[PDB]
């Protein structure tokens, strides 16, 4: 029916061993772990001289990180039986990471990992990591999460022989050289001692069988109570992982699960750590209850925030409480990531009981990071109830709460001073915010001169229009007329400067933006994205050296001296250059196919400009090579294998010149090769009608290879490849006869076809004799279409007798103009004759044999 488990239980809570071996005492005679057990950063585990056999099961994961001096993992866990894995780490239930001394695991008694995968890596001496089929250890379902890597598997593990021990998948199932691994038959699935000796299903991971014949589980599959296993906890108790406990025990049975521990709450039979969604935990933690306000929010204590590392402690806060004010005083100008960290700690904050203060912050760009603030109750306000929002001395505070974002300050006033970047008009956004609803702020509350001293305030908008766009240049036209001097005296002209000398000029920004969504500024120390033109008073600018057919972004701002407050800047806009001239085709390769064809292959790795409207191919027949007269043949015959700082600028100069001018004027006065034009389809067969002298074709933009035909045998062709693009409507009427440039440059490629299959052949050869005493003669016809000039003719002959080997003679191309004949003197007998030609392409083929009879007296 039911059985007691192995020995009396004595659980100990989640633990962690670090910095020295003596910390291992914490495991003294623990039977189980009510949480994770992690061991790490012991720089030398050798001195340890004890084991902990009584440890049998771990409710949560174990991770063994960077422990050194430990070779056999079993030295710590003699009898670790089941890894309940009730809660996983990153989805894993067992990690053995970077143990530079580990050689062996040796968990002989381990039999189940009820959840999660197993990760084992960087154990540069660990053999036998692969010698256990983990899927028979893991749960009885799909848990294919195992990952084994870099475990020194290269060659050194010669002790992989193991005692054999069971063998499967052509490898022994063994923890190490002496600890073989045993499976269970499918009749238990991991509650068995050997291949047949399996125990009650109520036990998980194994059992102990006494000499009395009784059986005891080493771990209860579902739950345990008073050392007795069963399917479910008895009523009046609450389950906590392995063992049912009383409520007064559950209240103290905490679990860590994060940098802050969570207590246990007895809830409907389960000792849950934190209440389900929408449920508050009673102040006495005796039970959970539904959220009194529907929503539940985590309270937190107010305190100074001196650095980002101090702000991260506020994660998950929703109500800030306590009489002390939340002082944001992050002096570290951490730069870009400051917003990231501050948002993480405070984005969820909703209500502040005791007002907010921002003081001496360096890199804090804006208070946007209060993404969910809705009430600064200010119950205790700052400084004797005078203030509830205290912004003072911030070098870079530029914006208060984002758009909308009501905050509804309830009590006290506000305080703003020495915020140079903060324009006063931005502070005035709070006028409808305060509960008092004042119509304006006194100088004592918001500094008239101490705020916005350097901020872009009252910006007007400039109309930027681009007149024309070229292949690599463009022009801009600031349409919004700006009255540099006072009108004197018409109206209009929204933007006006009281002094011509106070306006240095417009400055044009631009940068490459494939998406057209780049922004004017970003939270960065100094983002060098934008190219900045020099100040330009004229109002028209011409960008140069633009990469054609690329999308750009640009915007304009006025550059006034420091003391002038009138300024303006346009919205960011986009424009794209002209298609220009496309780049050259890439890796053009031409190979011969026969004496009549060529295969031309190419790709277009280099980027185009515009759209590839058409490819273009052309082949020009190069004049065939011919013999050089000074060469010789029949002495050197040819075999002839064929070839082929930020720093806002100083206005000191302008200011000083301005004042000197004022003084001087005050004192002076007183009162009383294949140009693309030819790129078109073209075909020109030779007069012989047998081959193309010039061949060209227009191809669709997806034929990466083309094949020729009707080519001349054994000749070099000047292959030619080109890419082209469509013409813009403005181009086709701006150009008349000169711009064009619609097609790319070319890389001539030379290929030589192949020699004619049957090559040079002599025909109509015949023997001859005069007056039938004179030497015999031979006459024949030169080949009709040889592979180039026949530099020499060769004739071979042999007597029709055994002894004489074949003899031959060689003659140059000369001497055949007389009758195309040749002569030789021979003795009485009968002979056989053969002839062939040889050309600058190589030896010709031999003709059929002749015969002759000779019989002078």
């Amino acid at each position: 029916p039911t059985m007691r488990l192995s020995q009396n239980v004595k659980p100990c809570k989640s633990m962690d061993i670090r910095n020295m071996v003596s910390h291992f005492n914490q495991l003294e005679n623990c039977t189980v772990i009510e949480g994770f057990l992690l061991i790490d950063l012991i720089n030398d585990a050798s001195p340890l001289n004890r084991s902990f056999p009584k440890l049998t099961e771990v409710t949560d994961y174990i991770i063994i990180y960077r422990v050194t001096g430990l070779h056999s993992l079993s030295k710590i866990f003699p009898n670790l039986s089941v890894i309940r894995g009730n809660k996983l780490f990153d989805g894993y239930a067992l990690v053995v990471y970077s143990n530079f001394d580990l050689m062996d695991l040796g968990l002989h008694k381990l039999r189940s990992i009820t959840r999660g995968g197993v990760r084992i890596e960087k154990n540069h001496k660990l053999c036998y990591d692969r010698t256990i089929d983990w899927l028979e250890i893991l749960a009885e379902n799909e848990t294919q999460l195992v990952v084994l890597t870099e475990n020194g598997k290269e060659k050194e593990c010669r002790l992989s022989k193991c005692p054999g021990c069971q063998l499967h998948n052509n490898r022994r199932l063994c923890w190490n050289s002496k600890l073989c691994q045993t499976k269970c038959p499918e009749k238990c699935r991991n509650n068995c001692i050997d291949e047949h000796t399996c125990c009650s299903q109520d036990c998980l991971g194994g059992c102990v069988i006494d000499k009395n014949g009784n059986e005891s589980c080493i771990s209860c599959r579902n739950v345990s109570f008073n050392n007795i296993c069963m399917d479910s906890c008895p009523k009046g108790y609450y389950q906590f992982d392995s063992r049912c406990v009383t409520a007064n025990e559950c209240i103290t049975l905490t679990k860590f699960e994060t940098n802050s521990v969570y207590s246990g709450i007895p809830y409907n039979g389960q000792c849950i750590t934190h209440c389900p969604t929408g449920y508050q935990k009673s102040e006495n933690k005796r039970m959970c209850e539904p959220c009194p306000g529907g929503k539940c929010d985590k309270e937190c204590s107010s305190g100074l925030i001196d650095s980002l590392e101090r702000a991260r402690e506020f994660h998950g806060c929703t109500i800030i409480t306590g009489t002390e004010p939340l002082t944001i005083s992050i002096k570290r100008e951490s730069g870009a990531h400051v917003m990231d960290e501050l948002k993480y700690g405070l984005a969820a904050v909703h209500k502040i009981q005791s007002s907010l203060m921002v003081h001496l912050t360096y890199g804090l760009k804006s208070l946007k990071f209060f993404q969910s603030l809705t009430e600064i109750s200010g119950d205790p306000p700052m400084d004797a109830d005078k203030y509830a929002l205290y912004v003072l001395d911030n070098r870079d505070l530029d914006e208060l709460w984002g758009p909308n974002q009501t905050v509804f300050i309830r009590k006290g006033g506000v305080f703003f001073h020495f915020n140079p970047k903060l324009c006063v008009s931005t502070i005035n956004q709070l006028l409808p915010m305060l509960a008092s609803k004042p119509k304006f702020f006194e100088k004592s509350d918001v500094g008239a001169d101490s705020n916005g001293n350097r901020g872009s305030c009252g910006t007007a908008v400039l109309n930027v229009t681009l007149q024309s766009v070229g292949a690599n240049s463009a022009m801009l036209n600031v349409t919004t007329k700006v009255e540099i001097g006072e009108p004197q005296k018409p109206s209009n002209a929204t933007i006006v400067f009281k002094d011509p000398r106070a306006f240095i000029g417009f400055v044009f920004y631009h940068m490459i933006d494939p998406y057209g969504n780049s922004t004017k500024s970003s939270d960065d120390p100094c983002d060098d994205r934008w190219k900045v033109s020099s100040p330009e008073k004229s109002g028209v600018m011409v960008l140069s050296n633009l990469i054609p057919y690329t999308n750009y972004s640009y915007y304009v701002r006025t550059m006034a001296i420091s003391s002038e407050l009138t300024n303006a800047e346009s919205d960011v806009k986009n424009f794209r250059t002209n298609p220009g001239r496309p780049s050259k085709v890439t890796e053009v390769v031409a190979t011969a196919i026969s004496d009549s064809k060529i295969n031309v292959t190419w790709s277009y790795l280099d980027k185009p400009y515009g759209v590839l409207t058409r490819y273009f191919i052309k082949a020009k027949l190069i004049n065939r090579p011919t013999r050089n007269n000074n060469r010789d043949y029949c002495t050197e015959p040819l075999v002839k294998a064929m070839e082929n700082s930020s720093q806002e600028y100083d206005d000191r100069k302008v200011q000083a010149g301005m004042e000197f001018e004022n003084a001087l004027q005050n004192f002076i006065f007183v009162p009383n090769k294949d140009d693309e034009n030819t790129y078109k389809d073209e075909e020109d067969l030779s007069s012989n009608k047998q081959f193309y002298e010039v061949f060209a074709k227009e191809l669709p933009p997806n034929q990466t290879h083309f094949v020729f035909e009707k080519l001349r045998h054994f000749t070099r062709y000047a292959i030619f490849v080109v890419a082209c693009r469509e013409e813009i409507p403005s181009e086709k009427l701006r150009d008349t006869s000169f711009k064009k440039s619609l097609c790319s440059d070319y890389d001539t490629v030379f290929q030589t076809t192949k020699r004619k299959k049957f090559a040079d052949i002599v025909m109509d050869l015949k023997v001859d004799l005069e007056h039938a005493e004179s030497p015999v003669r031979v006459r024949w016809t030169p080949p009709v279409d040889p592979n180039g000039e026949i530099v020499t003719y060769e004739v071979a002959y042999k007597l029709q007798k055994p002894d004489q080997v074949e003899e031959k003679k060689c003659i140059p191309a000369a001497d055949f103009n007389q009758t195309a004949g040749y002569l030789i003197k021979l003795n009485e007998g009968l002979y056989s004759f053969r002839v062939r030609a040889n050309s600058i392409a190589g030896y010709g083929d031999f003709t059929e044999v002749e015969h002759i009879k000779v019989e002078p007296p």
Partner: peptide, 24 residues
């Protein structure tokens, strides 16, 4: 106080007053 750039410029001036610094 009598200077041009303190009569015109700041405090603004008028053509009637301007035609006093030049009349000959």
């Amino acid at each position: 106080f009598r200077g041009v750039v303190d009569s015109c410029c700041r405090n603004s001036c008028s053509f009637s007053t301007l035609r006093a610094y030049c009349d000959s």
